[PDB]
Amino acid sequence: KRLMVMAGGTGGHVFPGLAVAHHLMAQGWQVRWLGTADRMEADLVPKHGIEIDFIRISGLRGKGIKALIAAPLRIFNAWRQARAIMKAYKPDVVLGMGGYVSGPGGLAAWSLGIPVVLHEQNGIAGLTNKWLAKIATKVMQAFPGAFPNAEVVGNPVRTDVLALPLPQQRLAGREGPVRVLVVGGSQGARILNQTMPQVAAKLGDSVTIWHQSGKGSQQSVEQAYAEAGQPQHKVTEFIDDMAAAYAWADVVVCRSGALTVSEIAAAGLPALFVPFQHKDRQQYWNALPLEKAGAAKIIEQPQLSVDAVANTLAGWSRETLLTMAERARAASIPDATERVANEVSRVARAL
Amino acid sequence: KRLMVMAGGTGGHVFPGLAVAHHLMAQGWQVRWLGTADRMEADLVPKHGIEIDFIRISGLRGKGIKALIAAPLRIFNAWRQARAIMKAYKPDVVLGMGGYVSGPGGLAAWSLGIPVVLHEQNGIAGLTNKWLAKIATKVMQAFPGAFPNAEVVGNPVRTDVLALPLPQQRLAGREGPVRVLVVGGSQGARILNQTMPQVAAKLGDSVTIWHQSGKGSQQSVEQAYAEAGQPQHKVTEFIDDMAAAYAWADVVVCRSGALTVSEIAAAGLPALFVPFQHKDRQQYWNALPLEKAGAAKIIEQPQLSVDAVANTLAGWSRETLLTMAERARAASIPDATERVANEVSRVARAL
């Protein structure tokens, strides 16, 4: 069976799409990618041993369906390019993980009678997925709320995180300072590198921190902690083994990208989410589900301060943290990858 | 007031000598150094703005004072070199901090009628100091036992450590995992770098570690802890602010060079001393004083192992550690520099 995946690196849709592709390739499936030449998937997908076909959508990015149809020549051309690719590759089903390229791609598949399956990783539907869903044979979403009735299947999560012991077991008999894990990602989180050292000064002996500063920020954060009078805290540029860090932690302080929220839920860890601000507030919507379940606390930019973070952490006892961890695990969906792959398989079967 | 300090090729002798030098220079005293052009003092002393005269003694092969004294022409020449140096500088007194170069220097001062003051930093007198004591006007030792009746004045301690709050204040209300500070010095202690990660594995959550690995060993030790399943421990190449680390720690695992032992006592901290093995067992004798006071535990490499260290730490309760801490502080002398400085002043005035 042939599967064509539409998922660009922008918006981070390529990673979950890659998870599904690899899962199906292990089932004998042939997978081909549909993306754009000057985007991240152009370099990453080939490194995964997967072939990729390109189309041009220049000037069409950021346009919703009404805006696309208002550009007759360009939308028709991208649509014709995708149609040619699909007539040649002849996929049995097309999977759209979100992203602008999936618009013309989805329209091409649909016009050719190829079933379209979509997956939305965020708490709020992306511009393209929102309208593409109307010609989709099957629509899935990671969290509830992005779409009114789409089956909730979660996002793919790293196997090592999924393998972690349940919260009660992991936290059993644990006493001593609340272990705070600060995660900034490869590039690091500027606001966290600046805020946490002062938070440490306010909380003193009540917490033990492992702060991941991001590339080239190890030295300055390490210095900030010493200046705050809490030099004993651990600061690393990166964390290669997130599963090991999650197993150690009592609570995590980090941004709320969609995959990150799913990973946190699967790890069964309480979190204090600092959503990246944006008029769309995508990350805010990604974290909301966990906050609603009482597994995390969201502090958007408009309320972020040293005192807000410090007071928030200080208010969480070990009993409260255990409850939050369990609620996180409960809000988790461990087999998102298999579920999506199975639905893509069922739809290709025309069942 | 002119003083000539004679201290050999080891920080053990040189560092305390520099403290006494600076202390007196800030009081109008003129100070000059006597050492060897090939040893570390040749580079360090000039960096402190102090002039340094050298004694050239070739063909020793590392034997030291015992060899020099067994070579008639060599001892005669070294003694005359020192006399020429003292005839030109005309010091009112000379301070010997140990080391073979102080031997010809002391003989020279004695032959010119210049009083000789000695300071022994270790639990066992160095051979040069032992013989020199036979012509010295005043002998002082850091710990009792080096010499039978020499005044005990201790060793110079960095003042940021001397100012650390008392054990009761530091440990008041402190709970949680025992904080273990592993110190290997600028070059690191290979055995500690290899032993502590394994010890961490055995003690798990009962301890929190801050391991100072030494130059170029940060990454290998960091990796060792991760492989031992305890990646959360802090690992730093160096520790500049030792006072801050000592403030944080509950117990210290380190070598027992003389200055280190005095520093541990001043910090009022329990310690697991791992003496550097040698025929003279110098470090063993430096530590023995604290252990006898019930402020530390000594473990020589022969009976040193993962289980040996882990078992020792696991056997110390917080109540016990507080006791040891108080014992350590009680066995401390905070005015070593001022004390030796005063004795030097008294002798120079022929009091």
UniProtKB/Swiss-Prot annotation, chains A, B:
Its main location: membrane. GO terms for cellular component: plasma membrane. It is found in: Cell inner membrane. Changing N122A: 64-fold decrease in kcat. Keywords: Cell cycle, Cell division, Cell inner membrane, Cell membrane, Cell shape, Cell wall biogenesis/degradation, Glycosyltransferase, Membrane, Peptidoglycan synthesis, Transferase. Changing Q283A: 114-fold decrease in kcat. One of its GO terms (biological process) is cell division. It catalyses: di-trans,octa-cis-undecaprenyl diphospho-N-acetyl-alpha-D-muramoyl-L-alanyl-D-glutamyl-meso-2,6-diaminopimeloyl-D-alanyl-D-alanine + UDP-N-acetyl-alpha-D-glucosamine = di-trans,octa-cis-undecaprenyl diphospho-[N-acetyl-alpha-D-glucosaminyl-(1->4)]-N-acetyl-alpha-D-muramoyl-L-alanyl-D-glutamyl-meso-2,6-diaminopimeloyl-D-alanyl-D-alanine + UDP + H(+). InterPro entries: GlcNAc_MurG, Glyco_trans_28_C, GlycoTrans_28_N. It is an enzyme of class 2 (transferase). One of its GO terms (molecular function) is UDP-N-acetyl-D-glucosamine:N-acetylmuramoyl-L-alanyl-D-glutamyl-meso-2,6-diaminopimelyl-D-alanyl-D-alanine-diphosphoundecaprenol 4-beta-N-acetylglucosaminlytransferase activity. It is a peripheral membrane protein. UDP-N-acetyl-alpha-D-glucosamine binds at residues 10-12, 122, 158, 186, 239, 258-263, 282-283. Cell wall formation. Catalyzes the transfer of a GlcNAc subunit on undecaprenyl-pyrophosphoryl-MurNAc-pentapeptide (lipid intermediate I) to form undecaprenyl-pyrophosphoryl-MurNAc-(pentapeptide)GlcNAc (lipid intermediate II). Strongly prefers UDP to CDP, GDP, ADP and TDP. Belongs to the glycosyltransferase 28 family. MurG subfamily. Homodimer. Associates with MreB and MraY. This is UDP-N-acetylglucosamine--N-acetylmuramyl-(pentapeptide) pyrophosphoryl-undecaprenol N-acetylglucosamine transferase. The lineage of its organism: Bacteria, Pseudomonadati, Pseudomonadota, Gammaproteobacteria, Enterobacterales. The gene is murG.
